[PDB]
RNA sequence: AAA
C-alpha cells in the first residue's frame, strides 16, 4: 500500500477530487476482507447518521422505521448504544426475511415480517402519527442472475420515494448506488441529501448512503452515472489502498482512518482521557460484538 | 365562441374532415376529467360486448389515479366484477386505499416484469390500460410506444387502451409500429394537444402492427390543429343542453353509452345526472 | 447481507 499524509478523509461523495476509468478485473479481488464486514459497514453509517440526529436534538422521542432490516445483526448494537445513553427510541424493523434472533426479547424493538408496499406504508403512518418518524431504508430486490438489474434498482428507488412521501419522516438514510452507465435505461429521480461515503464497504462497491433532514426531487442522468463510476473507482482503487502515515492509531489503513472520523461524532457515557482512547474503545466494542478480531 | 350546427361530434380521428397548418400557442382537474371520460367510454364499450365482467384491469402508469376511484365504484355498484391492478413508480391518491379489489404496485415495468405478472394473473382475462410517460422528446415517446407494444404481446389482453400522440414531424426520428385500433378523440384534452387514445379489441390472438411514417406525423399535426383551433372552439346551437360548448357536446355523446341502474325521463336527464356526478366527484364547480 |  502507498503512504500518504492526510488531515481528513473524504466524508461525502462530492469531496472525491479525482476519477479513474473502471477496470472490470476489479470484480476478482476479495470483496470483503473482514468477517461480517457488511454488518460493520451498516453499523458505522447508521451510528453516524443517528448521532448527527442526536446532535440536532431530533432523535430523542422518535421512532426509527427500518425497512429492509433483515438479518440486522448490527441493529442490536445500535439499539443498545442509544438505550445505554438514555435516549428514548422505539424501533420498528420490517423485512420479508427473518431477523437475526439476537434481536429477540427487546420491548422497544418491534419485528415485522412483511415486504412493504404503498398500502402497508399508509397503515403504519396512520398508526405512528403524529410521532416523529426516522426512516432507514436498506431494501434491495433481485430477480435471478447474481446481481440486481437496473429495473430492480429503479423499482427499489421508486419505492424509497414512496416511503418518503407517505411516512413523511423528519430524517432519512437511503441506500444509494447509481445504475452503471453500461446498463442505463431511463433517467429517474431521488431526494436531495448528503451522500455519505461508507468505510468497509465492499472493495469496489459504488454504494453510498443518502442522508436527508426535511424542513423536492433531483434528476439522475446517464452522465451522472458515468461520473459515479469513475469517482468511486478512483476512491476504491487508489484512495482506500493508502496507509495514512501521520495517523496516530494502531491501524493506519485508510478505512480505519475514515472510520475514526465517523466515530468521533458518537456520544458516550464513559469518559476517556483522550479522544483516541474513546475511539479505540468504541472500535473494539463494535468489533467484539460483530466477532471481528 | 363561434356558432355551429352539428348532428354528431367527431368521435374518432378518421372523422376529422379538414386540416390546418400549425402555429404557436381550463376547468379544474381537467386531466382527471379527460382520463375518466375516455376510460368510462372504453370500459362501457367492453361491457356491451360482454368481456368486462370477471376481468382484471392492468393499468400501467396509473398514479395518482384519482379518477380510478370513480370508475371502480361505477362498475362495482352495477354488479360488474372487476379486479384492478395499478402499477406505477410513484404513489397513488389515498382515495384508492382501503379497497380490497384494488392492488397498488410500485414498480418500474420492463419485459421481465410483464412476464411474471402474466403468470400470476392466469387464468384471469386481462384488460390493459396504459398511460405511461416520463417527465417530451421523440425518443422518450418511441421508448414508451415500444413498451406498450410488448405489454400487449406479453399480457395477451382481450382489449387495450393506449396513450397515443404522434411525434411532430419537426422532431421526427424514424418510422415505428403501433397496434391496430380505433383512435378515440378525447374531450377536455388540453387546448392544443394532439394526444388521442388507441382502443383495440382482440380475438383469436390477432394483433396487427401498423407503420407510422413522417407523412402520417404531418397529417396528424394538421388534422389535430384543425380540431383544436376550429372544431372545439365552436358552439353547437342545435344541442339541447345547459352547456353547448363543443367539449360538452363531445362528452354528452360519450356519456350516452354509459350504463346506469337509475331510470330517467329523458336521455338528456340521464347525461345531466352523470355529468353532475362526475364533476361533483372531481370537485369541479 | 451472509456465506
Ligand atoms: C401540438 N404541439 C405542441 N407543441 C409544442 O411542443 C411541446 C409538446 O407539448 P404537448 O403538450 O403537445 O405534448 P404532450 O406529450 O401531448 O403533453 P405533455 O404536457 O408534454 O405531457 C402530458 C402528460 O405527461 C404525463 N405526466 C404528467 N405529470 C407527470 C409527472 O409528474 N411524471 C411523469 N413521468 N409523467 C407525467 C401525463 O401522461 C400527462 O398526460 C410543447 O412545447 C408544445 O407547445 C408542438 N410543437 C410542434 N412542432 N408541433 C406541434 O404540433 C406541437
Ligand atoms: N419491499 C420490501 N420491503 C421490505 N424489505 C425488503 C423489500 N424488498 C427487499 N427487502 C429486503 O431488503 C434486504 C436487502 S439486504 C439488508 C440487510 C440489512 N440491512 C442488515 O442489516 O442485515 C433483504 O433482506 C430483503 O428481504
Ligand atoms: N416504466 C414505467 N413503469 C411504471 N410506471 C411508469 C413507467 N413509465 C412511466 N410511468 C408512469 O407513467 C405515469 C404518467 S402520468 C399517469 C397519470 C395516471 N393515468 C392518472 O390517472 O393520474 C407517471 O406516473 C409515471 O410514473
TrEMBL record, chain A:
<dbReference type="Pfam" id="PF01358">
    <property type="entry name" value="PARP_regulatory"/>
</dbReference>
<comment type="function">
    <text>Displays methyltransferase, positive regulation of the poly(A) polymerase and transcription elongation activities. Involved in the modification of both mRNA ends and in intermediate and late gene positive transcription elongation. At the mRNAs 5' end, methylates the ribose 2' OH group of the first transcribed nucleotide, thereby producing a 2'-O-methylpurine cap. At the 3' end, functions as a processivity factor which stimulates the activity of the viral poly(A) polymerase OPG063 that creates mRNA's poly(A) tail.</text>
</comment>
<keyword id="KW-0949">S-adenosyl-L-methionine</keyword>
<feature type="binding site">
    <location>
        <position position="68"/>
    </location>
    <ligand>
        <name>S-adenosyl-L-methionine</name>
    </ligand>
</feature>
<feature type="binding site">
    <location>
        <position position="116"/>
    </location>
    <ligand>
        <name>S-adenosyl-L-methionine</name>
    </ligand>
</feature>
<keyword id="KW-0808">Transferase</keyword>
<keyword id="KW-0648">Protein biosynthesis</keyword>
<keyword id="KW-0946">Virion</keyword>
<dbReference type="InterPro" id="IPR030375">
    <property type="entry name" value="Poxvir_cap_MeTfrase"/>
</dbReference>
<feature type="binding site">
    <location>
        <begin position="205"/>
        <end position="207"/>
    </location>
    <ligand>
        <name>mRNA</name>
    </ligand>
</feature>
<protein>
    <recommendedName>
        <fullName>Cap-specific mRNA (nucleoside-2'-O-)-methyltransferase</fullName>
        <ecNumber>2.1.1.57</ecNumber>
    </recommendedName>
</protein>
<dbReference type="GO" id="GO:0006370">
    <property type="term" value="P:7-methylguanosine mRNA capping"/>
</dbReference>
<feature type="binding site">
    <location>
        <position position="229"/>
    </location>
    <ligand>
        <name>mRNA</name>
    </ligand>
</feature>
<feature type="binding site">
    <location>
        <position position="95"/>
    </location>
    <ligand>
        <name>S-adenosyl-L-methionine</name>
    </ligand>
</feature>
<keyword id="KW-0507">mRNA processing</keyword>
<dbReference type="InterPro" id="IPR029063">
    <property type="entry name" value="SAM-dependent_MTases_sf"/>
</dbReference>
<comment type="subunit">
    <text>Interacts with poly(A) polymerase catalytic subunit OPG063. Interacts with OPG109 and OPG123; these interactions might help linking transcription to capping and polyadenylation.</text>
</comment>
<keyword id="KW-0489">Methyltransferase</keyword>
<dbReference type="GO" id="GO:0031440">
    <property type="term" value="P:regulation of mRNA 3'-end processing"/>
</dbReference>
<feature type="binding site">
    <location>
        <position position="39"/>
    </location>
    <ligand>
        <name>S-adenosyl-L-methionine</name>
    </ligand>
</feature>
<feature type="binding site">
    <location>
        <begin position="177"/>
        <end position="180"/>
    </location>
    <ligand>
        <name>mRNA</name>
    </ligand>
</feature>
<dbReference type="InterPro" id="IPR025804">
    <property type="entry name" value="Pox/kineto_cap_MeTfrase"/>
</dbReference>
<feature type="binding site">
    <location>
        <position position="182"/>
    </location>
    <ligand>
        <name>mRNA</name>
    </ligand>
</feature>
<feature type="binding site">
    <location>
        <position position="22"/>
    </location>
    <ligand>
        <name>mRNA</name>
    </ligand>
</feature>
<feature type="binding site">
    <location>
        <position position="72"/>
    </location>
    <ligand>
        <name>S-adenosyl-L-methionine</name>
    </ligand>
</feature>
<dbReference type="GO" id="GO:0044423">
    <property type="term" value="C:virion component"/>
</dbReference>
<feature type="binding site">
    <location>
        <position position="66"/>
    </location>
    <ligand>
        <name>S-adenosyl-L-methionine</name>
    </ligand>
</feature>
<feature type="active site" description="For methyltransferase activity">
    <location>
        <position position="175"/>
    </location>
</feature>
<dbReference type="GO" id="GO:0032259">
    <property type="term" value="P:methylation"/>
</dbReference>
<feature type="binding site">
    <location>
        <position position="97"/>
    </location>
    <ligand>
        <name>S-adenosyl-L-methionine</name>
    </ligand>
</feature>
<keyword id="KW-0506">mRNA capping</keyword>
<dbReference type="InterPro" id="IPR000176">
    <property type="entry name" value="mRNA_MeTrfase-like"/>
</dbReference>
<dbReference type="GO" id="GO:0004483">
    <property type="term" value="F:methyltransferase cap1 activity"/>
</dbReference>
<keyword id="KW-0251">Elongation factor</keyword>
<feature type="binding site">
    <location>
        <position position="138"/>
    </location>
    <ligand>
        <name>S-adenosyl-L-methionine</name>
    </ligand>
</feature>
Amino acid at each position: 500500500m502507498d503512504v500518504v499524509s492526510l488531515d481528513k478523509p473524504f466524508m461525502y461523495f462530492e469531496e472525491i477530487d479525482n476519477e479513474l476509468d473502471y477496470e472490470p478485473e476489479s470484480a476478482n479481488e476479495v470483496a470483503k476482507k473482514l468477517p461480517y464486514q457488511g454488518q460493520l459497514k451498516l453499523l458505522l453509517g447508521e451510528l453516524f447518521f443517528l448521532s448527527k440526529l442526536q446532535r440536532h436534538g431530533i432523535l430523542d422521542g422518535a421512532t426509527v422505521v427500518y425497512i429492509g432490516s433483515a438479518p440486522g445483526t448490527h441493529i442490536r448494537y445500535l439499539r443498545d448504544h442509544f438505550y445505554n445513553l438514555g435516549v428514548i427510541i422505539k424501533w420498528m424493523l420490517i423485512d420479508g426475511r427473518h431477523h437475526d434472533p439476537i434481536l429477540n426479547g427487546l420491548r422497544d424493538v418491534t419485528l415485522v415480517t412483511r415486504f412493504v408496499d404503498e398500502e402497508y406504508l399508509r397503515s403504519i403512518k396512520k398508526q405512528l402519527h403524529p410521532s416523529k418518524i426516522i426512516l432507514i431504508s436498506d431494501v434491495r430486490s433481485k430477480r435471478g442472475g447474481n446481481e440486481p438489474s437496473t429495473a430492480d434498482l429503479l423499482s427499489n428507488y421508486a419505492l424509497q420515494n414512496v416511503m418518503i412521501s407517505i411516512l413523511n419522516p423528519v430524517a432519512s438514510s437511503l441506500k444509494w448506488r447509481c445504475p452503471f452507465p453500461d446498463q442505463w435505461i431511463k433517467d429517474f429521480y431521488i431526494p436531495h441529501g448528503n451522500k455519505m461515503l461508507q468505510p468497509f464497504a465492499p472493495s469496489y462497491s459504488a454504494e453510498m448512503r443518502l442522508l436527508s433532514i426535511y424542513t423536492r426531487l433531483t434528476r439522475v442522468t446517464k452522465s451522472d452515472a458515468v461520473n459515479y463510476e469513475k469517482k468511486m473507482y478512483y476512491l476504491n482503487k487508489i484512495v482506500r489502498n493508502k496507509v495514512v502515515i501521520n495517523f496516530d492509531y494502531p491501524n493506519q489503513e485508510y478505512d480505519y482512518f475514515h472510520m475514526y472520523f465517523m466515530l468521533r461524532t458518537v456520544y458516550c457515557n464513559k469518559t476517556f482521557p483522550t479522544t483516541k482512547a474513546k475511539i479505540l474503545f468504541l472500535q473494539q466494542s463494535i468489533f467484539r460484538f460483530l466477532n471481528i478480531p
